[PDB]
Design a protein around this ligand. Structure first.
Ligand SMILES: *Cc1c(COP(=O)(O)O)cnc(C)c1O
Ligand SMILES: *Cc1c(COP(=O)(O)O)cnc(C)c1O
Lengths: 368, 361
């Protein structure tokens, strides 16, 4: 496995520049040679068995295959559950800075987003639980959309924070939707704990292998929706109301191959990515000791805090574009929380990353 | 049991589609892709011009995960909870789901079988369209399961009645490519006015539903944009399966030769059914449908019992043929037989239908 091969220089989007695992390609090619593409069921045993297998070997978490469901995308499932677990006008809690699509999904459903900003300190990001509860205790707060691992901070929640939150939500009648699409990209010592381990009552855990193996263009996602009534409601909306029960057979095939044979490839990728993130830390801290930037606990996205440099976000952006011809997502796209940050996608060959960092460093100096 | 019960075919898709998917496959990368792809749009324009003699504006085309998803959203968009959606019955099962799933009311206008094919009584339709609460007309064109291919006349009258009574039209034309008669299929865009939608896909024509994807024309900047922000913003479905796009491009650009060979094979299959059934039961002058590879067989002239017949087919012939009563009253006395399969299979199908009809006359 070699990721040291290249298949405005851009570092702005959610996906990677790598080709997927060869075992996935070989599996798609085989399914391809069968020629027939008639209607297929997602309630496929192999698919479900592959999921169960992945959770217990990669996450040491036991799940019931019967509670799993299919979805066209993770956001579609978040959107439907929101329509299902709340009334127009009620609130959905999310930690900010947040993944852009959450706002769309929440406000698109004429629901109100209730933000709880995360705090950066000593080592890592933290959620003030008193603040979160102050918001959850609100009568109109009905759902908590939890990004775990958290994008873009890369925070990997600890067993304690998950317990506390699971507890506060049960206490105030707030259902939890856990978006864990980044579950496989963990770098630290503390492992990712699937929400199912602390889950109570009505909850959902939503994921896919699209971010891990870079196959979003195949569509498909899956999740665990608990309380069989919540699950059936979701399904009759998926199949009956919206006519989306028929899955792309290739998305299923890719996941089966990914979860059954993709471990070796995923492990090589994790190492390559972690070193890439490390490279950024070394280059940035050497040039700007004040930064004291640590690599994230998870994710191949670098949420770089530049506030210590007292640089101007727009000036910097101008220099990157016109002078360095590099495209790096300016943190202010996430509202105030991201003022003074830049997000750099490290999911790419290092030769490419080198130019992006060199670019950032030049730009920063050009405007100090 | 030998099955003849589902919407798709038993054939492998066109080889040009496979070869195109394999090629896209070898590129290895499957990152985010845009559907606002010129080739895709160009392929669609090309298909409509050279197969339906209809000119369309590529700028009005949009992508959808499935046709029903598009019908569902437009319904949420062009009506209020509780209002009515008109459909001709017998209708495709999913229409009820889509309408009632959105807590909307379905207003049926039964089609009438007579002399030669099926017809819609326009006075009856208008009686329903004039209703204050009727806001949309879901038009299946060609119509499933009757196979009716509406005439350039009927599309004028209905387009007219709908404009007159403020009723928006959604035209589901997913069967557009499977036309057998002399009268060709007329895309709704040719008589369209104001706010309307034409929804299709190549999934039924090339048998690639397992690839997902569909596309359509939504008219009036407003409705189109509203649909798009719901697709991308609210439901997070704007990212398409790159393979569905690839399949369509290859289908519309090189699939003609394959589609033509299929049309002929299917038409003869339908014909085979007519010959075998009419020879055994002259007490029914069944004509092959104007479109579709589905046989909507009227057995009422035999005064047979739907359930008894069904019992004989299952236990005695071990053949599975969709009983028409699944479509409510309109389908009482009918059976739908999918002719989209190898004839060797069809033979053992029509055969089992006979040993069943006779077993219970
Ligand atoms: C990439 C990503 C998703 C994926 O959404 P799709 O609709 O399945 O592309 C969801 N959540 C987060 C937090 C992501 O970063
Ligand atoms: C098969 C069929 C469809 C296709 O629906 P999908 O949701 O795209 O599978 C739509 N309409 C009719 C009338 C059909 O027969």
């Amino acid at each position: 496995f070699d990721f040291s091969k290249v298949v405005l220089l851009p570092f702005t989007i959610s996906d990677m520049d790598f080709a997927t695992a060869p075992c996935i390609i070989e599996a798609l090619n085989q399914r391809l040679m069968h020629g027939v593409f008639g209607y297929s069921r997602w309630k496929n045993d192999e698919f479900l068995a592959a999921i169960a297998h992945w959770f217990s070997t990669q996450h040491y978490t036991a799940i019931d295959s019967q509670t799993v469901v299919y979805g066209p995308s993770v956001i579609y499932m978040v959107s439907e559950l929101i329509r299902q677990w709340s009334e127009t006008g009620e609130g959905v809690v999310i930690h900010t800075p947040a993944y852009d699509a959450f706002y769309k999904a929440i406000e698109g459903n004429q629901r109100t987003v209730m933000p709880v900003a995360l705090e950066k300190q000593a080592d890592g990001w933290f959620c003030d639980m008193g603040k979160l509860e102050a918001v959850l205790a609100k009568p109109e707060c009905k759902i908590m959309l939890l990004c775990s691992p958290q994008n873009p901070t890369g925070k990997v929640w600890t067993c304690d924070e998950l317990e506390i939150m699971a507890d506060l939500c049960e206490r105030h009648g707030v259902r939890v939707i856990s978006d864990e699409i980044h579950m496989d990209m963990v770098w630290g010592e503390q492992p990712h704990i699937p929400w199912s381990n602390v889950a109570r009552g009505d909850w959902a855990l939503l994921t896919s292998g699209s971010k891990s193996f870079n196959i979003p263009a195949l569509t498909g996602a899956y999740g665990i929706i608990e309380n069989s009534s919540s699950r059936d409601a979701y399904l009759s909306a998926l199949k009956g109301r919206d006519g989306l029960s028929s899955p792309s057979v290739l998305a299923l095939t890719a996941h089966i191959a990914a979860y059954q044979q993709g471990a070796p490839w995923l492990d090589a990728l994790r190492i390559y990515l972690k070193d890439n993130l490390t490279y950024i830390a070394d280059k940035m801290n050497a040039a700007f000791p004040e930064l004291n930037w640590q690599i994230p606990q998870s994710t191949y996205l670098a949420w770089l805090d530049l506030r210590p440099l007292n640089i101007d976000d727009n000036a910097l952006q101008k220099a990157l574009i016109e002078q360095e011809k590099v495209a790096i997502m300016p943190g202010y796209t996430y509202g105030e929380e991201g003022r003074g940050f830049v997000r750099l996608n490290a999911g790419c060959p290092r030769s490419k990353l080198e130019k992006g960092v060199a670019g950032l460093i030049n730009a920063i100096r050009a405007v100090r």
